[PDB]
Scaffold this active site. Structure first.
Site, mmCIF file in Angstrom:
data_model
loop_
_atom_site.group_PDB
_atom_site.id
_atom_site.type_symbol
_atom_site.label_atom_id
_atom_site.label_comp_id
_atom_site.label_asym_id
_atom_site.label_seq_id
_atom_site.Cartn_x
_atom_site.Cartn_y
_atom_site.Cartn_z
ATOM 1 N N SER A 97 4.996 -3.578 -14.199
ATOM 2 C CA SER A 97 6.409 -3.414 -12.860
ATOM 3 C C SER A 97 8.006 -3.310 -13.360
ATOM 4 O O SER A 97 8.493 -2.312 -12.465
ATOM 5 C CB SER A 97 6.122 -4.278 -12.578
ATOM 6 O OG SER A 97 7.169 -4.714 -10.656
ATOM 7 N N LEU A 108 -5.843 -2.881 -11.245
ATOM 8 C CA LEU A 108 -4.714 -4.347 -11.517
ATOM 9 C C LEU A 108 -4.662 -4.649 -9.589
ATOM 10 O O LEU A 108 -4.894 -5.670 -8.937
ATOM 11 C CB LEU A 108 -4.287 -4.684 -12.459
ATOM 12 C CG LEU A 108 -3.177 -4.421 -12.134
ATOM 13 C CD1 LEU A 108 -1.985 -5.589 -11.279
ATOM 14 C CD2 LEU A 108 -2.217 -4.851 -14.086
ATOM 15 N N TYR A 109 -3.807 -3.094 -9.183
ATOM 16 C CA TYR A 109 -3.384 -3.268 -8.181
ATOM 17 C C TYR A 109 -4.194 -2.944 -6.150
ATOM 18 O O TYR A 109 -4.124 -2.806 -5.112
ATOM 19 C CB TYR A 109 -2.408 -1.976 -8.116
ATOM 20 C CG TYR A 109 -1.103 -2.580 -7.111
ATOM 21 C CD1 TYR A 109 0.180 -2.283 -8.624
ATOM 22 C CD2 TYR A 109 -0.843 -3.244 -6.198
ATOM 23 C CE1 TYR A 109 1.351 -3.132 -7.967
ATOM 24 C CE2 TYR A 109 0.550 -4.025 -5.915
ATOM 25 C CZ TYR A 109 1.297 -3.483 -6.473
ATOM 26 O OH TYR A 109 2.663 -3.946 -6.657
ATOM 27 N N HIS A 126 -7.310 -5.126 -2.292
ATOM 28 C CA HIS A 126 -8.503 -5.103 -0.544
ATOM 29 C C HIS A 126 -9.229 -6.191 0.173
ATOM 30 O O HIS A 126 -8.888 -6.443 0.910
ATOM 31 C CB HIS A 126 -9.389 -3.829 -1.128
ATOM 32 C CG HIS A 126 -8.604 -2.280 -1.521
ATOM 33 N ND1 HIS A 126 -8.483 -1.950 -2.779
ATOM 34 C CD2 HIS A 126 -8.811 -1.477 -0.468
ATOM 35 C CE1 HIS A 126 -8.490 -0.785 -2.451
ATOM 36 N NE2 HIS A 126 -8.118 -0.592 -1.795
ATOM 37 N N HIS A 139 0.787 3.209 -3.679
ATOM 38 C CA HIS A 139 0.921 5.644 -3.256
ATOM 39 C C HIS A 139 1.615 5.926 -3.185
ATOM 40 O O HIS A 139 0.918 7.231 -3.164
ATOM 41 C CB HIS A 139 -0.148 5.213 -1.711
ATOM 42 C CG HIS A 139 -1.497 4.754 -1.703
ATOM 43 N ND1 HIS A 139 -1.475 3.377 -2.364
ATOM 44 C CD2 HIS A 139 -2.574 5.155 -1.639
ATOM 45 C CE1 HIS A 139 -2.768 3.253 -2.172
ATOM 46 N NE2 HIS A 139 -3.172 4.175 -1.374
ATOM 47 N N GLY A 154 0.495 -7.459 -14.711
ATOM 48 C CA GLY A 154 1.261 -6.949 -13.503
ATOM 49 C C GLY A 154 2.976 -6.594 -13.767
ATOM 50 O O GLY A 154 3.548 -5.672 -13.157
ATOM 51 N N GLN A 173 0.585 -0.940 0.086
ATOM 52 C CA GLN A 173 0.214 0.394 -0.804
ATOM 53 C C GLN A 173 1.455 1.541 0.033
ATOM 54 O O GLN A 173 0.583 2.347 -0.782
ATOM 55 C CB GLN A 173 -0.579 0.041 0.983
ATOM 56 C CG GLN A 173 -2.274 0.762 1.572
ATOM 57 C CD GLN A 173 -3.218 1.403 2.200
ATOM 58 O OE1 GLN A 173 -2.400 0.546 3.057
ATOM 59 N NE2 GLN A 173 -3.758 1.920 1.832
HETATM 60 C C1 COH Z 1 -1.525 -2.388 -2.387
HETATM 61 C C2 COH Z 1 -2.847 -3.712 -1.923
HETATM 62 C C3 COH Z 1 -3.914 -1.779 -1.238
HETATM 63 C C4 COH Z 1 -4.198 -2.206 0.109
HETATM 64 C C5 COH Z 1 -3.584 -2.599 1.386
HETATM 65 C C6 COH Z 1 -4.474 -0.780 0.867
HETATM 66 C C7 COH Z 1 -5.112 -0.595 2.028
HETATM 67 C C8 COH Z 1 -6.826 -0.166 2.375
HETATM 68 C C9 COH Z 1 -6.540 0.085 3.360
HETATM 69 C C10 COH Z 1 -6.565 -0.095 4.391
HETATM 70 C C11 COH Z 1 -6.422 -0.219 5.937
HETATM 71 C C12 COH Z 1 -7.450 0.859 3.313
HETATM 72 C C13 COH Z 1 -8.728 0.975 4.709
HETATM 73 C C14 COH Z 1 -8.208 1.523 2.158
HETATM 74 C C15 COH Z 1 -8.819 2.415 1.435
HETATM 75 C C16 COH Z 1 -9.227 2.563 0.576
HETATM 76 N N1 COH Z 1 -8.247 2.877 -0.985
HETATM 77 CO CO1 COH Z 1 -6.894 0.984 -0.723
HETATM 78 N N2 COH Z 1 -5.429 -0.336 -0.648
HETATM 79 C C17 COH Z 1 -4.387 -0.677 -1.759
HETATM 80 C C18 COH Z 1 -4.694 -0.245 -2.723
HETATM 81 C C19 COH Z 1 -5.315 0.435 -3.337
HETATM 82 C C20 COH Z 1 -4.900 1.198 -4.148
HETATM 83 C C21 COH Z 1 -3.831 0.630 -5.648
HETATM 84 C C22 COH Z 1 -6.322 2.368 -4.380
HETATM 85 C C23 COH Z 1 -6.362 3.693 -5.587
HETATM 86 C C24 COH Z 1 -5.312 4.540 -5.806
HETATM 87 C C25 COH Z 1 -5.449 6.011 -6.368
HETATM 88 O O1 COH Z 1 -5.378 5.343 -7.497
HETATM 89 O O2 COH Z 1 -5.379 7.073 -5.941
HETATM 90 C C26 COH Z 1 -7.155 2.867 -2.773
HETATM 91 C C27 COH Z 1 -7.497 3.697 -2.450
HETATM 92 C C28 COH Z 1 -7.808 3.102 -1.642
HETATM 93 C C29 COH Z 1 -9.449 4.055 -1.498
HETATM 94 C C30 COH Z 1 -10.396 5.608 -2.315
HETATM 95 C C31 COH Z 1 -8.877 6.152 -2.955
HETATM 96 C C32 COH Z 1 -7.859 7.459 -1.931
HETATM 97 O O3 COH Z 1 -8.780 8.051 -1.640
HETATM 98 O O4 COH Z 1 -7.238 7.665 -2.354
HETATM 99 C C33 COH Z 1 -9.665 3.658 -0.435
HETATM 100 C C34 COH Z 1 -10.816 4.090 0.347
HETATM 101 N N3 COH Z 1 -6.269 1.436 -2.986
HETATM 102 N N4 COH Z 1 -7.685 0.466 1.360
HETATM 103 C C1 LIG Z 2 12.422 -6.039 -12.469
HETATM 104 C C2 LIG Z 2 11.116 -6.999 -11.607
HETATM 105 C C3 LIG Z 2 10.107 -6.846 -12.436
HETATM 106 C C4 LIG Z 2 10.245 -8.549 -13.240
HETATM 107 C C5 LIG Z 2 9.993 -9.644 -12.201
HETATM 108 C C6 LIG Z 2 8.986 -11.135 -12.965
HETATM 109 C C7 LIG Z 2 8.503 -11.856 -12.507
HETATM 110 C C8 LIG Z 2 7.351 -11.505 -11.472
HETATM 111 C C9 LIG Z 2 6.756 -12.359 -11.520
HETATM 112 C C10 LIG Z 2 5.572 -12.190 -10.587
HETATM 113 C C11 LIG Z 2 4.823 -10.639 -9.943
HETATM 114 C C12 LIG Z 2 3.656 -11.001 -9.721
HETATM 115 C C13 LIG Z 2 2.589 -10.307 -9.664
HETATM 116 C C14 LIG Z 2 2.502 -8.650 -10.531
HETATM 117 C C15 LIG Z 2 1.596 -8.093 -10.250
HETATM 118 C C16 LIG Z 2 1.721 -6.853 -9.820
HETATM 119 C C17 LIG Z 2 3.175 -6.380 -9.539
HETATM 120 C C18 LIG Z 2 3.511 -5.580 -8.007
HETATM 121 C C19 LIG Z 2 5.758 -5.534 -8.283
HETATM 122 C C20 LIG Z 2 5.100 -3.350 -8.590
HETATM 123 O O1 LIG Z 2 4.445 -3.004 -7.441
HETATM 124 O O2 LIG Z 2 5.810 -3.042 -8.955
#
Ligand code: COH
Ligand SMILES: CCCCC/C=C\C/C=C\C/C=C\C/C=C\CCCC(=O)O
Ligand code: COH
Ligand SMILES: *[C@@H]1O[C@H](CO)[C@@H](O[C@@H]2O[C@H](CO)[C@@H](O[C@H]3O[C@H](CO)[C@@H](O)[C@H](O)[C@@H]3O)[C@H](O)[C@H]2NC(C)=O)[C@H](O)[C@H]1NC(C)=O
Ligand SMILES: *[C@@H]1O[C@H](CO)[C@@H](O[C@@H]2O[C@H](CO)[C@@H](O[C@H]3O[C@H](CO)[C@@H](O)[C@H](O)[C@@H]3O)[C@H](O)[C@H]2NC(C)=O)[C@H](O)[C@H]1NC(C)=O
Ligand SMILES: *[C@@H]1O[C@H](CO)[C@@H](O[C@H]2O[C@H](CO)[C@@H](O)[C@H](O)[C@H]2NC(C)=O)[C@H](O)[C@H]1NC(C)=O
Ligand SMILES: *[C@H]1O[C@@H](CO)[C@@H](O[C@@H]2O[C@H](CO)[C@@H](O)[C@H](O)[C@H]2NC(C)=O)[C@H](O)[C@H]1NC(C)=O
Ligand SMILES: CCCCC/C=C\C/C=C\C/C=C\C/C=C\CCCC(=O)O
Ligand SMILES: CCCCCCCCO[C@@H]1O[C@H](CO)[C@@H](O)[C@H](O)[C@H]1O
Ligand SMILES: *[C@@H]1O[C@H](CO)[C@@H](O)[C@H](O)[C@H]1NC(C)=O
Ligand SMILES: *[C@@H]1O[C@H](CO)[C@@H](O)[C@H](O)[C@H]1NC(C)=O
Lengths: 551, 551
Positions: free
Chosen positions: B499, B353-354, B357, B176, B495, B172
């Site tokens: 990446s 795709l990221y 949640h 971000h 992904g 996260q």
């Molecule tokens: C990568 C994994 C991940 C996690 C673990 C996570 C953990 C959590 C979390 C933990 C306690 C809470 C309360 C929320 C709640 C939210 N998340 Co995320 N989020 C995640 C990926 C994302 C992504 C990517 C976005 C889009 C952000 C953007 O585009 O600004 C997002 C957007 C949001 C939003 C609305 C967008 C904004 O206004 O910024 C809320 C609300 N959330 N999420």
């Molecule tokens: C330079 C390293 C990149 C090569 C990776 C090669 C193989 C990766 C295999 C699986 C990766 C798994 C999921 C992809 C989804 C999101 C990317 C997360 C990493 C990032 O947030 O960027």
């Protein structure tokens, strides 16, 4: 003082302080090692024994006219040579860019902040004991004395290569899309954030400006019709901000992409030609695509004009400057199996070296009239009175000044030439010889070697004392020119790699853009691939007068 | 309606209308020709027959541990395999970037406006007869129905790969910095203009913000000391804008690079860890360079942290996600003799795709406490009470949820998941199978093939009717996972190329940056090359607790 003041590291090695009194040279990938990166690696020895000098490559291209005639007519071989011309110059420019006026070491700020011009060499440190580092006197010679002794025009010196006023004004128009110094901030800062050929000087730098210039019908730009002729719209109509003196009347305050183009009728000529061209290309696209809306017609026309511009700059403009018998080619495909970075950052030194004011004549000769600077500046009446056809005819005829060779800066712009020196110093530029080495050239061993001549050399030795503290900009203007050429070696060797990068770096030259579909199909692609200075004039100027970049 | 609505061009051909009712495919460099680019060139016909499927390659990399154990310990082989890993992907991302939400054709506006997320596929035209082009019903299924039927969590499904809360909160915090949607403008717009790993979540997107966060002594960031522990400074002390509900105590209003990080104590844990790391790297550099000023210390530390981030993301984070027995390597040197663009533009689909949640647990278990979402949200008090040491120990031990496999999105964030769906539609995303084809995957032929199961497949079929109109985001969350994996095939294949580009594209990976002098000498360089998630926590958390991304 900074331990690196003496520029101790050679062959592109990076200097770094290692204590108050000590430095270290990073020799990574230079092909050299030792304290100062001077000891050649074995393969480097073999490359230095084999690779020809810049002055040998240049002879071959400027002689053997009869052989180049064969070469130019065989597509496979022309492609092969053009490939070499492109790739030889490649490793010279840092891309992603590195230093700038505030950063003598790599930093995210220098990388990420587009408001800066980049730097090919880091600035001399603020605490150095001399302006150039450690060599020379405590002060550089008064710029006034430098300008007067060796830069200012006595008798006019025509360009022996035959450059005309169409060339000088094209150079000015073209380069002012990417040289847009932000004087609010300082000479190391630019307002050209696109950093290359994006035609902002036609379309505007900002979307707000572009929208005020656009007609929103048929993809076109706004225009007016005066006596049956298409000209740019006014400031009062577009509400586009332009630079004019107070006394310039409402009707003569033309509005175009680039705020300064009302300065000179020469610029307004090209501004009008290109506006006509854009609307001409919209008409063609509309015929091919009766289904398209205004926005796609506009954007596609823009892309076609970017290609035309690159095409023209390489095949007419650079061709003319080079004096090469070999026929240069605009072919993005030549770079497709090479390592090359599709991105650009405008270097401050590229701006500095492009201060070609020696091109300007004593008077501007249009038809039977001979206008002074006082009369020419800010006078768009001149343009309306004579017409674009007469402007093209007259400027095609009128020879420009030699740039190198010394003493050719017209007196009317002496303040501008003094500013290039002053600003050069304010931005803490390194010496001529530092810049020559940075671009794989041998440093000059005397002022006589630099000028090729005796009288100017003596003025310069009396002003500077040491050849290693001679400044870049005056040197470019006093340098021994190539035989019968407009420029000397330093201008060419510094200019060309910067040029290559701004031209080929453009995203439209990348494999995902270089397709007929990007340009509205085969017809739009063909407009790019058959563009020339003549066709630009012919298609857009009444009566299709003959033109070129030489007299 | 638009003649390209059906998406007739295959294999990366480009579609272009040629009249109101007709289209033409541009097959340049696709390897195919014919009307829809469906006929393979002879060399393509061969390339296909031999090239292993992604599932074959995935199987090879997740088995034969005894061979990988040999390869991982023979540096030359490890580098060869990593070179393949980096170069196999590459060609799948357009760079320079191309489309965006408002531009389904190449344009200068799309290339140059950094405010947009880019697009791996153009949007569906506004006038198409169905949401996805021409297939399906006139309206997609109600988004609440899709969410409730196949997304929402019934029982908590643990990640069978063992991902912990250190991993979830790392994901996260890291993402971000580059997913920062400008909700004032729309879902297709970003505030992360640097478009990658610039560490703006630590340092600030703007210079104004960075300067408020800096101490201006020894290169450091401002901080406060509460109970002997170093924490980020306050909103009141710095005047840095943060998102906090009115009721938060002044000293718990922490100010960091990214404005939303007060939302979760999980994020504030990493903000604090990385703030500590920056000031620690300052102390090292000050010892190496007592001659340096605050400004160079800051900038060089920033570059070092960027290097550390990339290193950890590749060798710990991606390594853990991949499930590979092969040890991924961060080594820019591997691309030096390759074609590769050192630039990146963040894709909207990468953002979409990221949205992992489902990683989120039902409660947050720290020490003996179990915190509900309501209790944990905005409660930095929890962080101070327990301390970073207990945060790490607890989060290392708590399992995260499985992402693919369906029905695992916690109802606490149901509004966010709904929004992912609604925003996909507002941004006119193409269908799942269009995205699969774009990334060299066979389109799914039924809903049962997508889920690997019968019950969700039947709900999805009654909702969507045709597999060819199944949407990307819900599909990634219901997809049949790789054996005992957290993700499905579609997540990995889309992904991974995004990446690579965001990691290797960074300028510090370019040959002119990847040198010891860039990071203040060998000592700076070595901080990067030995960084690990374990060393980060060990160096900046009292008691050096064991940590990792798996339970
Ligand atoms: C990568 C994994 C991940 C996690 C673990 C996570 C953990 C959590 C979390 C933990 C306690 C809470 C309360 C929320 C709640 C939210 N998340 Co995320 N989020 C995640 C990926 C994302 C992504 C990517 C976005 C889009 C952000 C953007 O585009 O600004 C997002 C957007 C949001 C939003 C609305 C967008 C904004 O206004 O910024 C809320 C609300 N959330 N999420
Ligand atoms: C330079 C390293 C990149 C090569 C990776 C090669 C193989 C990766 C295999 C699986 C990766 C798994 C999921 C992809 C989804 C999101 C990317 C997360 C990493 C990032 O947030 O960027
Ligand atoms: C390329 C050849 C060329 C030509 C033919 C040309 C023709 C002319 C011309 C007559 C038509 C006039 C009256 C001027 C006058 C000026 N030029 Co030029 N300029 C040229 C190249 C440049 C460049 C490049 C700059 C820097 C522009 C910038 O950075 O904004 C410049 C800058 C200037 C400035 C601002 C200088 C300062 O104070 O910083 C003035 C005034 N001049 N120039
Ligand atoms: C790229 O570099 C530019 C030069 O450093 C930078 O402009 C500078 O920005 C700062 C901070 O916004 C300005 O400082 C202003 O605010 C301070 C503190 O509140 C005042 O004391 C000052 O008087 C001033 O108003 C500088 O004025 C400005 N420096 C200049 C123009 O030379 C840009 O912001 C950087 N660009 C990006 C995108 O970050
Ligand atoms: C980045 O691309 C953006 C997307 O279009 C663009 O945002 C838009 O900016 C324009 C013009 O600045 C705004 O349109 C204006 O139109 C009239 C002026 O006659 C006003 O009444 C409006 O209130 C408005 O100012 C758009 O509203 C705006 N669109 C948004 C915010 O979604 C950016 O300007 C582009 N950035 C660059 C550097 O060009
Ligand atoms: C490293 O390069 C530098 C060139 O600046 C050399 O530094 C010295 O050069 C002279 C010869 O030793 C001395 O007279 C000076 O003390 C010193 N220069 C300055 C400006 O302090 C040094 O010799 C080079 N070393 C090698 C291995 O060639
Ligand atoms: C390849 O491209 C496609 C474009 O969709 C195909 O057109 C379709 O042909 C189908 C088979 O007869 C028809 O059912 C359908 O009318 C038509 N699609 C649309 C939406 O018009 C082209 O025929 C095909 N060309 C080739 C040479 O394979
Ligand atoms: C954005 C910047 C890019 C556009 C600049 C383009 C052209 C500027 C032209 C010349 C610069 C100075 C000297 C070059 C003279 C001859 C070139 C011969 C080498 C070659 O054959 O290359
Ligand atoms: C906490 C989840 C809220 C879902 C309630 C409304 C949607 C009903 O959804 C139903 O849920 C059943 C139980 O999982 C499944 O057997 C069905 O396939 C599904 O359609
Ligand atoms: C303006 O240029 C015109 C040409 O139409 C000329 O007649 C007039 O003298 C010029 N005015 C000035 C102020 O030089
Ligand atoms: C704040 O978190 C603390 C733990 O230190 C907890 O006791 C309290 O209930 C939380 N506040 C809210 C509003 O839940």
């Amino acid at each position: 003082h900074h331990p690196c003041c003496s520029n101790p590291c050679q062959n592109r090695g990076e200097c770094m302080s290692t204590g108050f009194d000590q430095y270290k040279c990073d020799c990574t990938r230079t092909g050299f090692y030792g304290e100062n990166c001077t000891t050649p690696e074995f393969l480097t020895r073999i490359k230095l024994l084999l690779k020809p000098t810049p002055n040998t490559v240049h002879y071959i291209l400027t002689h053997f006219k009869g052989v180049w005639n064969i070469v130019n007519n065989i597509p496979f071989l022309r492609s092969l040579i053009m490939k070499y011309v492109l790739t030889s110059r490649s490793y010279l420019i840092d891309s992603p860019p590195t230093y700038n006026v505030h950063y003598g070491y790599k930093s995210w700020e220098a990388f990420s902040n587009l408001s800066y011009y980049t730097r090919a060499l880091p600035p001399v440190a603020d605490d150095c004991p001399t302006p150039m580092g450690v060599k020379g006197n405590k002060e550089l010679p008064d710029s006034k004395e430098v300008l007067e002794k060796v830069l200012l025009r006595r008798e006019f010196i025509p360009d022996p290569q035959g450059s005309n006023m169409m060339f000088a004004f094209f150079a000015q128009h073209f380069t002012h899309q990417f040289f847009k110094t932000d004087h609010k901030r300082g000479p190391g800062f630019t307002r050209g954030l696109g950093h290359g050929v994006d035609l902002n000087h036609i379309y505007g730098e900002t979307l707000d400006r572009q929208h005020k210039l656009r007609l929103f019908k048929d993809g076109k730009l706004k225009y007016q019709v005066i006596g049956g002729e298409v000209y740019p719209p006014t400031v009062k109509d577009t509400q586009v901000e332009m630079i004019y003196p107070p006394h310039i009347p409402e009707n003569l305050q033309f509005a175009v992409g680039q705020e300064v183009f009302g300065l000179v009728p020469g610029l307004m000529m090209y501004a009008t030609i290109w506006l006509r061209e854009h609307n001409r290309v919209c008409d063609i696209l509309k015929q091919e695509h009766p289904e398209w809306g205004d926005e796609q017609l506009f954007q596609t026309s823009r892309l076609i004009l970017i290609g035309e511009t690159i095409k023209i700059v390489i095949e007419d403009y650079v061709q003319h400057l080079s004096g090469y018998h070999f026929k240069l080619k605009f072919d993005p495909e030549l770079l497709f199996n090479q390592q090359f970075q599709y991105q650009n950052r405008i270097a401050s030194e590229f701006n500095t070296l492009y201060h070609w004011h020696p091109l300007l004549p004593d008077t501007f000769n249009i038809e039977d009239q001979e206008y002074s600077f006082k009369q020419f500046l800010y006078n768009n009446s001149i343009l309306l009175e004579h017409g674009l056809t007469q402007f093209v005819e007259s400027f095609t005829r009128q020879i420009a000044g030699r740039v190198a060779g010394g003493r050719n800066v017209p007196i009317a712009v002496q303040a501008v030439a003094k500013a290039s020196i002053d600003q050069s110093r304010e931005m803490k530029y390194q010496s001529l010889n530092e810049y020559r080495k940075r671009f794989s050239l041998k440093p000059y061993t005397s002022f006589e070697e630099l000028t090729g001549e005796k009288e100017m050399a003596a003025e310069l030795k009396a002003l500077y004392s040491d050849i290693d503290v001679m400044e870049l900009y005056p040197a470019l203007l006093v340098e021994k020119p190539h035989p019968d050429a407009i420029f000397g070696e330093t201008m060419v060797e510094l200019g060309a790699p910067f040029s290559l990068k701004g031209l080929m770096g453009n995203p439209i030259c990348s494999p995902q853009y270089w397709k007929p579909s990007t340009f509205g199909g085969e017809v739009g692609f063909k407009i790019i691939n058959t563009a020339s200075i003549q066709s630009l004039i012919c298609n857009n100027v009444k009566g299709c007068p003959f033109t070129s970049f030489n007299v």
